[PDB]
Design an enzyme around this catalytic site. Structure first.
Site, PDB file in Angstrom:
ATOM      1  N   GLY A   1       1.852   6.946   8.539  1.00 55.46           N
ATOM      2  CA  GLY A   1       3.244   7.376   8.371  1.00 55.46           C
ATOM      3  C   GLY A   1       4.248   6.316   8.810  1.00 55.46           C
ATOM      4  O   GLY A   1       5.400   6.373   8.404  1.00 55.46           O
TER       5      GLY A   1
ATOM      6  N   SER B   1       3.466   3.156   8.130  1.00 55.68           N
ATOM      7  CA  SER B   1       3.171   2.115   7.132  1.00 55.68           C
ATOM      8  C   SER B   1       4.417   1.625   6.407  1.00 55.68           C
ATOM      9  O   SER B   1       5.254   2.427   6.001  1.00 55.68           O
ATOM     10  CB  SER B   1       2.228   2.679   6.070  1.00 55.68           C
ATOM     11  OG  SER B   1       0.914   2.808   6.589  1.00 55.68           O
ATOM     12  N   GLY B   2       4.513   0.308   6.220  1.00 56.74           N
ATOM     13  CA  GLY B   2       5.651  -0.294   5.515  1.00 56.74           C
ATOM     14  C   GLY B   2       6.849  -0.574   6.404  1.00 56.74           C
ATOM     15  O   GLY B   2       7.755  -1.315   6.021  1.00 56.74           O
TER      16      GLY B   2
ATOM     17  N   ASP C   1      -0.115  -7.572   1.826  1.00 53.11           N
ATOM     18  CA  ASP C   1       0.377  -6.184   1.831  1.00 53.11           C
ATOM     19  C   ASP C   1       1.905  -6.132   1.997  1.00 53.11           C
ATOM     20  O   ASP C   1       2.419  -5.802   3.059  1.00 53.11           O
ATOM     21  CB  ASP C   1      -0.345  -5.367   2.920  1.00 53.11           C
ATOM     22  CG  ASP C   1      -0.096  -3.868   2.799  1.00 53.11           C
ATOM     23  OD1 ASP C   1       0.452  -3.432   1.764  1.00 53.11           O
ATOM     24  OD2 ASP C   1      -0.449  -3.122   3.754  1.00 53.11           O
TER      25      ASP C   1
ATOM     26  N   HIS D   1       0.811  -1.231   0.000  1.00 58.98           N
ATOM     27  CA  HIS D   1       0.000   0.000   0.000  1.00 58.98           C
ATOM     28  C   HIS D   1       0.849   1.290   0.000  1.00 58.98           C
ATOM     29  O   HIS D   1       0.316   2.385  -0.195  1.00 58.98           O
ATOM     30  CB  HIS D   1      -1.099  -0.025   1.078  1.00 58.98           C
ATOM     31  CG  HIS D   1      -0.649   0.411   2.437  1.00 58.98           C
ATOM     32  ND1 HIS D   1      -0.332  -0.481   3.439  1.00 58.98           N
ATOM     33  CD2 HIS D   1      -0.548   1.645   2.986  1.00 58.98           C
ATOM     34  CE1 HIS D   1       0.000   0.187   4.531  1.00 58.98           C
ATOM     35  NE2 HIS D   1      -0.134   1.479   4.286  1.00 58.98           N
TER      36      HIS D   1
HETATM   37  N1  LIG Z   1      -1.435   0.191  13.768  1.00 57.02           N
HETATM   38  C1  LIG Z   1      -2.412   0.970  13.294  1.00 57.02           C
HETATM   39  N2  LIG Z   1      -3.417   1.266  14.021  1.00 57.02           N
HETATM   40  C2  LIG Z   1      -2.284   1.497  11.892  1.00 57.02           C
HETATM   41  C3  LIG Z   1      -1.308   0.953  11.067  1.00 57.02           C
HETATM   42  C4  LIG Z   1      -1.146   1.400   9.761  1.00 57.02           C
HETATM   43  C5  LIG Z   1      -1.954   2.413   9.269  1.00 57.02           C
HETATM   44  C6  LIG Z   1      -1.719   2.824   7.864  1.00 57.02           C
HETATM   45  N3  LIG Z   1      -2.183   3.862   7.317  1.00 57.02           N
HETATM   46  O1  LIG Z   1      -1.851   4.070   6.003  1.00 57.02           O
HETATM   47  C7  LIG Z   1      -1.802   5.402   5.504  1.00 57.02           C
HETATM   48  C8  LIG Z   1      -0.506   6.055   5.915  1.00 57.02           C
HETATM   49  O2  LIG Z   1       0.402   5.392   6.628  1.00 57.02           O
HETATM   50  O3  LIG Z   1      -0.284   7.213   5.599  1.00 57.02           O
HETATM   51  C9  LIG Z   1      -2.942   2.963  10.079  1.00 57.02           C
HETATM   52  C10 LIG Z   1      -3.106   2.512  11.403  1.00 57.02           C
END
Ligand SMILES: N=C(N)c1ccc(/C=N/OCC(=O)O)cc1
Ligand SMILES: [Ca+2]
Length: 223
Positions: A175, A177-178, A84, A40
């Site tokens: 932020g 993510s990944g 993912d 993603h």
């Molecule tokens: N652990 C979480 N609650 C969690 C983990 C990953 C995300 C991912 N968001 O994607 C959009 C971005 O990163 O900008 C959101 C919440």
């Protein structure tokens, strides 16, 4: 990262920042030429930034290397976030040292209850928005698959696991993510998704890296 701590400069030497004119995702260096991130996080024109602590200041230990190719998992589903995971190849090999180092792939899957290290430059607020300059860290346990499925009924596949705290307050976030989830010195998870961040009964959901080692090895052997 919500409710975490300042890691300490270059204490997470496998952590990378993906940059497209700005930081937009994390990733993990798995050898001198390859980064594992979330599918993603895919976009064109990625620059990989290694050896970072403060992402807004050049502090002297960084290596900025353009991506030459990005390979999204062939079964990645952007709707469900199943599979993912993405590989990013660097245009030139990173110079490995104390501040820039690879993280091992797992040979076996991690265990429920194991405390893992999750890191990134993502949002530090569960409500509202604040982005840190320096790398943040969180120690969080892997949750049972039954508690994970209960938290997210109908949404958890065999390629996902939950980690964190059902009481809320501590989690990865936008932020991050990944980025890496490292358990017992192996890359076991990738920051993938969750409902909000650090919300009660809504733990983080992570890509189950141990399911992808064969695909990773085959892909790196051919690209
Ligand atoms: N652990 C979480 N609650 C969690 C983990 C990953 C995300 C991912 N968001 O994607 C959009 C971005 O990163 O900008 C959101 C919440
Ligand atoms: Ca920097």
């Amino acid at each position: 990262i919500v409710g975490g701590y300042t890691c300490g400069a270059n204490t997470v030497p496998y952590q990378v920042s993906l940059n497209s004119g700005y930081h937009f995702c994390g990733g993990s260096l798995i050898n001198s030429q390859w980064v594992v991130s979330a599918a993603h996080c895919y976009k064109s024109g990625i620059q990989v930034r290694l050896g970072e602590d403060n992402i807004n200041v050049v502090e002297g230990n960084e290596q900025f290397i353009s991506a030459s190719k990005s390979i999204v998992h062939p079964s990645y589903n952007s709707n469900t976030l199943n599979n993912d995971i993405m590989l990013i190849k660097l245009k030139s090999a990173a110079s490995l040292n104390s501040r820039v180092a690879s993280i091992s792939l797992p040979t076996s899957c991690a265990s429920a209850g194991t405390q893992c290290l999750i890191s990134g430059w993502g949002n530090t607020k569960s409500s509202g928005t604040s982005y840190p300059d320096v790398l943040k860290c969180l120690k969080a346990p892997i949750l049972s698959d039954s508690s994970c499925k209960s938290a997210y009924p109908g949404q958890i596949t065999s390629n996902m696991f939950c980690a964190g705290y059902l009481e809320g307050g501590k989690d990865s976030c936008q932020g991050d993510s990944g980025g890496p989830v490292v358990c017992s010195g192996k890359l076991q998870g990738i920051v993938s998704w969750g409902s909000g961040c650090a919300q009660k009964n809504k733990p983080g959901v992570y890509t189950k890296v141990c399911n992808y080692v064969s695909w990773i090895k085959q892909t790196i052997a051919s690209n």
